[PDB]
């Protein structure tokens, strides 16, 4: 169209055409906007566009156009500044300075073009980072001088100094070399005395609040790094904590400054500094009480109303109070004239803690944790805070969150529990009274609600283990009584459900009570069993979860014969298991069997444990024998979805029991093992037959997914047992060979879409646990899965994501436990192994990249361990520089920054091999270098050539200095990594200083 004319640089730039493109992008819509966007991006990226910024900035009447012109200049200054003729550098500086001056002198422009002025200020700072102070020593003196001739210029200078401070001290670590950052930090430190004088003068005298605010904004940045003397040996704390707290315009930034002051590095043996630290806190709290709100104010309501900047102010007040008090409250705790200040500050925090704002609550709660931990351990402190702590008990009990998917909520509950446990130790009587009182107002209906009875139940459950057993005893009884009467008194299943659940939750949290009151524990369990027949939504899930939770803690009381009982209760559970679980869904039945397996594993007499095990598995074992008789006499039955589902649930039941019994599960595994693997083969045939008759789409059908579920659950069962087995002779002699014969060929000879990644996961556990004992078995695993899996995943980074992850987990453990298996690979297959490792480097998927880098490191170590033998010598000749160059590639390509640390570790290992002369043969060819040349010399030569061709804009001196430093530092990972980071900075620009690489000296 017509808009594309600005992209034709052989002609003069039509400014009015630019402004139409810009307006269309920023103010337009739809297709017009989109087209203009792509034109602007092409314009901005033209490497000559900067030559036209001078024009745009003088003659455009569109601020967005000038902003884009400055973005263009920014790219040039930060990446190609030093390549320019010195005349352009001076020229660019001059018309940035001049444009800033002229915008500040025009009061209309100064007030209406803040965005453009801010961008120009930042562009100036980019030039300062290049030119100052070495080529601009007068910048600061002239800034200070020019500040006196105009309020606008003075205010804008505060913005420039703020951005400069940010660029030098807050954001330099990632963006500059170590040497350049230090150079700029020293330069600012050298001239800060002058800067502070101007800053303090403005604060003490000025009246323009826009100028005051800007000066305070810069001060906030300075407080990150300046010496504490500028703050404590001047009157500035007084100004901050009085004058600037009274005006709302300056109150927000001043509070942020005082928060950072509360973090200054300060000597703790100076009484006068301590008094100053007390004083500015006293002043600040005084101003809040008189100018903002008294300590009785309802901050919950204020925050909810959300007027003006109230929410940000209350957030900042919480940050100030918690920051200061976590560091300095001891200053206030001894002097009785400071006691009111100490408690008023904490009373504000109490009020702040009632605000409905999850993230703010976490901020105050972190502080409360700091406090109550100190009162728990520090002599003579807790009495000071008795009334604060009493209020805090109520705050936390009333904002308890759900303990048991929301991980933000899980963490918050644990934090709340920790604070409440401390608070219970600090005064166990007060805690009990609050909870019983809250309970009464659930019964009397004055605070009754679903949310409120749940909240209180979680709180009561959270303090288990803090009271004495006798107090806990009385307390538990009281709670259960009141809760039972509360359920009885409510109408409808909905109300009765909520209360019965809370009742079971509390009970599950007090195993100490259960362990000492068998008749009670027994009645509890039997009630849960009754609840497993209740069809009201959630009652059955609650019953099963409570059951296994109690069992995990009280299992011993189920396996012994209890006084006045005629058998261990586990026998009674088993006898009636069919009735008990008749109305449960499969998932819930499995939880029940898992809970039974926990109990059974506490029986240490083998004959009694195995008998309980066989009795527990009676129902699944009978269903199993049946189906093995049927599905064998007519393999078609397995197409019956109902039989497939029955089979899967049998296997899932075995998984559930094996999960809790581990090594003890072996007798049950032996009952089913051989027929289970035969079933694995039969299902495998059916899957293949279906794919043949219906095509790949068969794998999506419910029939085939049901069949594959059988395969996956069989694999999970074997993996679960082997990962916990204690008799590894039996694993090797009885389990492994049938397993491999059943799974490996089937995996290899299925089409890719029918291969189960779970096969790889199962094999990983086999190798992990008994790999050292089955060297021929490991070879067979590689032969059957290595090449065919690699071919699935080596065409892109996305297809077959699970196979990808499990593939490299398997290679990692084989490389760890049976490296000999890679030695047996034919040379072409070992080359694929190396290709596969490097392929893993290039993944952005963390679950692949990390294993790939660890395989590479482990492999280099394995080769080194072999000494001076032909396989190791050939390995280095074939693959050393492949690993060096591939590691360098991912280090420097800006798309694998997540792996920097492990890339650096691998590179340092590789380089240290050569400079420890641990590679015995020459790494070069006979011809390409004279005889006798050390590998050290050749490595430096190879790397110089590699970096010269990959980064042609670096000078030979840059490359040589970088490699000299990197080489020297290959025994010091932290410094090594610093040098790599410096290199990553320098490759982003032209003309990096080669002496930067001497930073570590």
């Amino acid at each position: 169209g017509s808009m594309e004319g600005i992209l034709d640089f052989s002609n003069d730039l039509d400014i009015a055409l630019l402004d139409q493109v810009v307006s269309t992008f920023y103010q337009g819509s739809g297709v017009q906007q989109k087209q203009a966007q792509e034109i602007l991006t092409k314009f901005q990226d033209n490497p000559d566009a900067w030559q036209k910024a001078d024009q745009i900035l003088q003659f455009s009447t569109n601020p967005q156009s000038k902003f884009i012109a400055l973005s263009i200049l920014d790219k040039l200054i930060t990446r190609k500044w030093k390549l320019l003729p010195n005349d352009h550098r001076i020229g660019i500086r001059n018309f940035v300075v001049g444009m800033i001056i002229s915008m500040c002198q025009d009061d209309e422009v100064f007030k209406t073009q803040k965005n453009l002025i801010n961008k120009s200020d930042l562009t100036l700072v980019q030039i300062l980072k290049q030119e100052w102070p070495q080529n601009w020593p007068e910048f600061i003196p002239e800034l200070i001088g020019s500040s006196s001739s105009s309020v606008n210029v003075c205010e804008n200078n505060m913005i420039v100094l703020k951005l400069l401070s940010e660029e030098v001290f807050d954001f330099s670590a990632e963006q500059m070399t170590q040497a350049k950052a230090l150079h700029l930090k020293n330069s600012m430190s050298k001239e800060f005395e002058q800067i502070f004088k101007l800053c303090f003068q403005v604060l003490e005298q000025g009246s323009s609040s826009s100028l005051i605010v800007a000066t305070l904004e810069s001060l906030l940045r300075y407080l990150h790094w300046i010496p504490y003397r500028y703050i404590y040996e001047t009157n500035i704390l007084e100004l901050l904590s009085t004058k600037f707290m009274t005006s709302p315009d300056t109150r927000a930034i001043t509070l942020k400054c005082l928060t950072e002051v509360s973090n200054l590095k300060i000597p703790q043996d100076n009484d006068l500094i301590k008094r100053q630290t007390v004083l500015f806190f006293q002043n600040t709290l005084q101003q809040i009480a008189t100018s903002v709100m008294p300590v009785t104010a309802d901050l919950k309501a204020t925050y909810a109303n959300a007027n003006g900047n109230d929410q940000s102010f209350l957030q900042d007040l919480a940050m100030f109070l918690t920051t200061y008090l976590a560091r300095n409250r001891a200053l206030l705790e001894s002097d009785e004239s400071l006691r009111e200040l100490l408690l008023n500050a904490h009373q504000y925090l109490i009020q702040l803690s009632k605000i409905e704002e999850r993230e703010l609550f976490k901020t105050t709660l972190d502080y409360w944790h700091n406090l109550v931990a100190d009162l728990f351990y520090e002599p003579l402190k807790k009495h000071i805070y008795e009334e604060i702590c009493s209020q805090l008990r109520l705050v936390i009990i009333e904002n308890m969150v759900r303990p048991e998917k929301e991980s933000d909520t899980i963490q918050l509950y644990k934090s709340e529990r920790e604070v409440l446990v401390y608070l219970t130790h600090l005064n166990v009587i007060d805690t009990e009274e609050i909870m019983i009182s809250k309970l009464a107002r659930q019964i009397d209906g004055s605070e009754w609600s679903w949310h409120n009875i749940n909240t209180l139940s979680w709180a009561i459950g959270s303090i288990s283990g803090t009271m004495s057993e006798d107090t806990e005893k009385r307390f538990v009884v009281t709670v259960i009584k009141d809760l039972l009467g509360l359920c009885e008194q409510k109408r409808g299943k909905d109300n009765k459900a909520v209360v019965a659940s809370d009742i079971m939750y509390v009970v599950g949290q007090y195993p100490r009570f259960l362990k000492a009151h068998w008749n009670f524990l027994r009645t509890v369990i039997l009630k849960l069993f009754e609840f497993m027949h209740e069809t009201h939504e959630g009652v059955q899930d609650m019953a099963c979860d409570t059951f296994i939770k109690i069992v995990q803690k009280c299992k011993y009381h189920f396996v012994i014969q209890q006084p006045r009982e005629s058998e261990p209760f586990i026998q009674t559970i088993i006898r009636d298991i069919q009735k008990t679980t008749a109305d449960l869904q499969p998932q819930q039945v499995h939880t029940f069997y898992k809970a039974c397996g926990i109990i059974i594993s506490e029986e240490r007499s083998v004959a009694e444990r195995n008998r309980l095990l066989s009795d527990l598995m009676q129902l699944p074992n009978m269903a199993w024998d049946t189906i093995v008789e049927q599905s064998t006499a007519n393999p078609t039955l397995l197409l019956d979805s109902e039989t497939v589902k029955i089979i899967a649930n049998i296997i899932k039941t075995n998984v559930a029991v094996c999960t809790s019994m581990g090594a003890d599960f072996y007798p049950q595994l032996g009952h089913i093992y051989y027929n289970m693997l035969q079933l694995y083969r039969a299902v495998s045939s059916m899957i293949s037959a279906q794919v043949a008759a219906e095509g790949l789409i068969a794998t999506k059908t419910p029939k085939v997914r049901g069949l594959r579920t059988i395969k996956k659950e069989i694999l999970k069962l074997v993996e679960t047992y082997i990962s916990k087995a204690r008799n590894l002779d039996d694993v090797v002699k009885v389990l492994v060979e049938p397993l491999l014969n059943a799974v490996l060929e089937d995996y290899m000879n299925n089409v890719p879409d029918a291969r189960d990644a779970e096969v790889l996961n199962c094999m990983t556990t086999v190798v992990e646990k008994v790999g050292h004992m089955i060297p021929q078995g490991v070879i067979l695993i590689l032969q059957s899965v290595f090449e065919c899996t690699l071919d699935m995943i080596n065409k892109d980074f996305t297809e077959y994501p699970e196979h990808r992850v499990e593939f490299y987990k398997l290679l990692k453990v084989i490389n760890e436990k049976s490296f000999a298996a890679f030695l047996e690979l034919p040379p072409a297959a070992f080359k694929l192994f190396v290709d596969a490792i490097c392929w893993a480097f290039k993944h952005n998927n963390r679950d692949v990249e990390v294993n790939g880098l660890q395989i590479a490191l482990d492999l280099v170590k394995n080769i080194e361990r072999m000494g001076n033998v032909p396989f190791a010598n050939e390995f280095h000749k074939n693959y050393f520089f492949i690993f060096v160059s591939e590691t360098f590639f991912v280090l420097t390509d800006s798309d694998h920054k997540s792996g920097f640390s492990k890339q650096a570790l691998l590179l340092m290992k590789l380089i240290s091999l050569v400079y420890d002369n641990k590679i015995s043969v020459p790494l070069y060819q006979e011809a390409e270098v004279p005889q006798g040349t050390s590998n050290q010399v050749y490595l430096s030569q190879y790397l110089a050539n590699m970096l010269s061709n990959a980064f042609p804009h670096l000078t030979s001196e840059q490359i040589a200095s970088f490699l000299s430093a990197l080489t020297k530092q290959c025994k010091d990972l932290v410094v090594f990594k610093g040098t790599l980071r410096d290199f990553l900075v320098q490759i982003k620009e032209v003309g990096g200083d080669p002496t930067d690489y001497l930073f570590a000296e």
């Binding site: 005893k473 009884v477 259960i480 009584k481 039972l484 009467g485 359920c487 009885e488 409808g492 299943k493 009765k496 459900a497 019965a500 009742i503 009151h517 008749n519 009670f520 009645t523 509890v524 039997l526 009630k527 609840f531 209740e534 009201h536 009652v539």
Partner: peptide, 16 residues
């Protein structure tokens, strides 16, 4: 100890 009234009331808990 036993606390038999807690047990009794527990045995009678009902969802409806």
């Amino acid at each position: 100890s036993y606390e038999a009234e807690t047990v009794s009331a527990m045995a009678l808990l009902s969802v409806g």
